[PDB]
Design a protein around this nucleic acid. Structure first.
Lengths: 153, 352, 219, 351, 150
DNA sequence: CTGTTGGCAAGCCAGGATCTGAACAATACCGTCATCGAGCACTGCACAGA
DNA sequence: TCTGTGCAGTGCTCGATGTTTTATTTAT
């Protein structure tokens, strides 16, 4: 019972310029529930199941930062979000804290801005799993990967 | 049905109801997970020393190893019924130890005593030497009607329930009792990582810091209590009591198992919680429900609700798989359903 | 080349006797001659009073036992000893009557994590054929066990059949190879012997004669 | 097939079901790791002394043995060593159309024949013979009324059996029960509060205890069972076997149960017929690791092991399984039974 | 392959006051996973290898009692932790029992409280080796060393 | 039927000290060698004579 | 037609008794 992350990534990349532009326009994830093009995209990914939809809101909202912002890559673990943000070298550690300390919906807004800023090369399905379990464990591993990668350079 | 199974789920607020040699909470590994534990001997002593037992069952037994102190108690209690000489010899025959005037006379081991039972014995001892009947033949005579001895355990029911052994004296032959109640150690339905209280003791003559710094283990827990009563064995242990007499005693055990909590650390933790679920079931073979919690219960709006639910599901699995159809009743605050504990107890009193 | 019958003796607990008249029941390191005969005699329907075919089995068959080390997760597990405090209530006091003791005490030793591979061949004047011994271990009449009835098998008794020049060469066909071999027939490069009193005197029930294994170390 | 294999996985709550002469739990090393053990003899006695056993085995119909009906076959069996004069004299003094006869019956009577044959030669009879053989006669008379118990469990520790044919093994063989997983046992530190002592307790002690998912194994030799029942039928033997299945699933040793009360029934029971009886203990040779308990991974490890080796081990044959759990099942070659009774019926009907 | 215990000891010793304070206020070993300063401290000692993680958590959490609580002293085996706690003459035997009986995380918490009280002088690489395994054998040897000293 | 792009995301410096961490009393017993003959029990034994 | 004191006949529990044992003690 898991969302096909790569399929959703492909579904977004192939999506018509008009529909995806309607989605990007959104300012916070809960507003996506008022856009018709949104359901049109996430329908073949089990939006019907209430468990999937909260994760789907997060996944699309991150995908809706741009269309070219998140360059997916393939494992040679696979690049995590924490590694990717640190790899860009544009993000400082205090902005990472402002993500993992942010409250509900505020966190996704910050993450969105971070993706736009960093334009990261990462493993998208890996990131999709993080957004599904966006918990205390994910925040903590996010900071870990960022600090270690930054410190290595 | 000869067995009465009793199942209790009881939840306690933070406390330390039973601890070991280093004052740490007793525990046990079950399903690969640590459970906080309350020993069966702690449960049994909390019940037998309780007010409810005293009011509804009678006097708990006298458990001691100090015969010299016991000697003096019997002299003060059985003095107006027997002469001091007979009282001394009776204890001597039963314990196998020389009862003189020594300050310290010690038995083989700690042994439960019943005054009423000792009173019955010294009658026999008196009549024995009166009829010029020696001790070797006195023992031979008394071995012929043990039931007449066991009727005295109606004055010491906790022995009829929990048993007695002796390795010296006539008690070896006449006082062997196989307890009618079987009882498990209470264990939590879930995993517990115990808390630690870091405390100080402030000294009124010491302005800088405290006079003592220490740590004390404690935790909460939903506990599973199990016990059963062998009715036929309980009747035999009471000198041939009726089933109604055994059933009424079982009913008091049910009540105590649902309400009695060990007193340890309760003055400073006060976990005076009654049970949230009690389940009584008649059977031909004893049946514990512990494996309802072999897979440790995960919390979901508390531990109590998912514990009761796990209990119910496993009960059905066993009943459906083993085709069990003994009478059963269930009282809960969260199979015949009982709104009150009292109705549940009437049910047991009426043979289910 | 002669025909060999290859057997596997594996189980969590085994017991192979040493001389005793005591409540202590000791085990050796590998299966005994008497114990292997009894195991075969169990697969065949031989009763304890049938001294005739009891002697026909003994005169027809000779053995070779290899000790197999348990390997687990690529790690070696050694054979360990186990002491069982084994009591008996109401045990006979005499050989006739119904008088009995309250409690008697015995001490029984077992092997743990032990496994064995046994090579079996016919003596030059044997009565039976390996073909019927193969049938016996595939479909035993009496229950087969490893020394004591409380010790079941976890692997089939039958492992295989083959033809070869010596027992060592026969056991080579069957993994795991490398364990020490004790044989009733000597092999060329080895001269060591293992003394034992495990030759059952069939004319004298439950009594044993001295004999000797030929020792063949593994590489 | 001649053998019935019985496999039980049974989970016990904290207890001390079987201990040694230091009061320590019995154990065993299996796969290089410590398993708590309940001995064969302890498990078997729990069955043999149980109420269920006394009612279904001790009070069986095939229980009684009548020397009268056995006169003919006994007359020809012992007819080559003894002549009908002694054989019939013996047969009558023991009691005061049978096809076959139980081996120990022949052997024990043959011993009595040897005694009366030597009694006539030494020229003594009347009470003198019945005085010398008083206890011996009383012994065999008791045994002649416990034929199913003797056929199933073997002779008692005191039986009065005299011959080698009188060494009667049980037709069922019970293995030592061991945990599927490694166990580090707990310790209970206890006090005994003296009602007449002010400071402290009158005794202190420790008791070793633990939980454990145990694997019980037993097999039944059908032909041996039939042969020791005077030549009973397969159906009658399968009926006895049904009781063994029931006891191995429900009977627990009484040790320490008054104070630990581990009254747990089996969560998995499986029966399979074979020509070669095998324990499935190596399903747990690599010790089972806990994953939401030990019970679920144990049943799982049992099922996966069967799927892997059953074919090559020649465990083709009738196989059925009862389970309180909904763990992914074995191969479809094993027939799933929803209740224990349905499993037992499956055994009665030869599989 | 093995954690350089003295290098880590030195790294903790010459840590800046900020990074040190951020680590010290941790209340249990797992909370070190929230501290950026912690990751930078243990990265050159093999943190990214999961094999070393539980060991490094124990080591640093013991050090986190303070820069001046554990004083390393060279061998003349070297002074074990058990002997060092007894050498202080400040620790009751009962507290050692309670330490070696404690379960996970709680054991490290109680240990650090003992280190704070005792301020031990010991063989640090020897204590680190003990912290690496921390099996039932190591805990019993701790208690027995303490007792054999007193 | 049709929805875009570039360019850009900071630095300094700072994390404490005092002082304190308990005591008492109590850890069991039995049986799992044998010998000899005596004194004293179940226990059937027919009966003789009631 | 059942039953009573003598047995013969022995099943015992009774008690004193044959023998014989000890080896250690960190690290600082």
């Amino acid at each position: 019972d898991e969302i096909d992350a790569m399929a959703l990534y492909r579904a977004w990349q192939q999506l018509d310029n008009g529909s995806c532009a309607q989605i990007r326009r959104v300012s916070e994830p809960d507003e996506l529930r008022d856009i018709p093009a949104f359901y049109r995209l996430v329908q073949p990914f089990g939006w019907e199941n209430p468990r999937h939809q909260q994760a789907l809101l997060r996944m699309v909202f991150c995908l809706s930062a741009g269309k070219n912002v998140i360059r997916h890559q393939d494992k040679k673990t696979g690049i995590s979000l924490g590694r990717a943000l640190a790899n860009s070298g544009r993000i400082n550690e205090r902005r990472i804290f402002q993500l993992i300390r942010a409250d509900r919906t505020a966190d996704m807004v910050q993450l969105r801005r971070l993706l736009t800023h960093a334009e990261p090369v990462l493993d998208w399905p890996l990131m999709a799993r993080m957004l599904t379990w966006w918990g205390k464990r994910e925040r903590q591993q996010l900071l870990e990967d960022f600090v270690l990668t930054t410190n290595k350079n | 049905s000869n067995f009465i199974n009793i199942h209790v789920l009881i939840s306690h607020s933070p406390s330390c109801l039973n601890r070991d040699d280093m004052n740490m909470q007793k525990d046990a590994i079950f399903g690969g997970k640590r459970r906080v534990r309350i020993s069966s001997q702690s449960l049994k002593r909390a019940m037998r020393k309780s007010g409810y037992y005293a009011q509804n069952i009678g006097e708990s037994s006298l458990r001691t190893i100090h015969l010299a102190q016991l000697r003096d108690v019997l002299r003060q209690k059985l003095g107006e019924r027997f002469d001091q000489k007979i009282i001394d010899k009776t204890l001597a025959l039963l314990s196998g130890k020389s009862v003189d005037e020594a300050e310290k006379i010690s038995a083989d081991a700690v042994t439960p005593w019943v005054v009423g039972e000792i009173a019955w014995f010294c009658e026999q001892v008196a009549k024995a030497e009166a009829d010029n009947l020696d001790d070797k033949k006195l023992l031979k005579v008394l071995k012929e009607d043990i039931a007449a001895i066991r009727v005295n355990l109606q004055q010491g029911v906790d022995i009829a329930l929990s048993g007695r052994m002796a390795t010296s004296g006539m008690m070896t032959e006449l006082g062997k009792v196989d307890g009618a109640m079987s009882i498990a150690h209470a264990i939590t339905t879930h995993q517990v990582d115990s808390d630690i209280d870091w405390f100080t003791a402030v000294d009124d003559l010491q302005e800088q810091g405290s006079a003592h710094l220490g740590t004390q283990e404690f935790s909460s827990g939903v506990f599973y209590r199990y016990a059963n009563i062998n009715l036929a064995q309980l009747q035999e242990n009471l000198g041939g009591a009726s089933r109604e007499q055994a059933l009424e005693i079982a009913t008091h055990v049910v009540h105590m198992l649902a309400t009695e909590v060990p007193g340890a650390k309760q003055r400073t933790y006060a976990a005076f919680n009654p049970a949230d679920m009690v389940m009584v079931n008649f059977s031909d073979m004893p049946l514990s429900m512990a494996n309802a919690f072999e897979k440790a219960v995960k919390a979901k709006d508390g531990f109590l609700q998912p514990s009761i639910q796990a209990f119910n599901q496993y009960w059905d699995r066993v009943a459906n798989g083993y085709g069990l159809n003994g009478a059963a009743a269930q009282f809960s605050l969260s199979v015949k359903q009982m709104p009150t504990l009292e109705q549940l107890k009437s049910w047991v009193r009426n043979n289910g | 080349m002669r025909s060999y019958l290859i057997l596997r003796l594996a189980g969590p607990m085994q017991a192979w006797g040493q001389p005793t008249f005591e409540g202590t029941r000791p085990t050796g390191r590998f299966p005994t001659r008497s114990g292997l005969l009894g195991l075969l005699g169990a697969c065949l329907g031989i009763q304890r009073d049938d001294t005739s075919s009891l002697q026909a089995l003994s005169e027809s068959v000779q053995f070779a036992v290899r000790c197999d080390e348990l390997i687990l997760d690529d790690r070696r597990v050694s054979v360990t000893g186990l002491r069982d405090y084994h009591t008996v209530l109401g045990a006979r006091e005499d050989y006739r009557g119904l008088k009995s003791h309250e409690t008697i005490q015995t001490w029984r030793e077992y092997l743990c994590d032990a496994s064995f591979t046994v090579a079996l061949w016919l003596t030059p004047h044997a009565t039976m054929v390996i073909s019927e011994l193969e049938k016996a271990v595939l479909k035993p009449r009496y229950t087969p066990y490893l020394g004591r009835r409380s010790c079941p098998l976890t692997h089939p008794l039958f492992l295989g059949t083959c033809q070869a020049s010596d027992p060592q060469k026969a056991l080579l066909n069957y993994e795991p190879v490398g364990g020490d071999i004790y044989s009733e027939e000597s092999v060329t490069g080895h001269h060591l012997k293992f003394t034992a009193r495990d030759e059952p005197m069939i004319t004298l029930p439950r009594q044993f004669a001295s004999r000797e294994w030929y020792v063949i170390k593994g590489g």
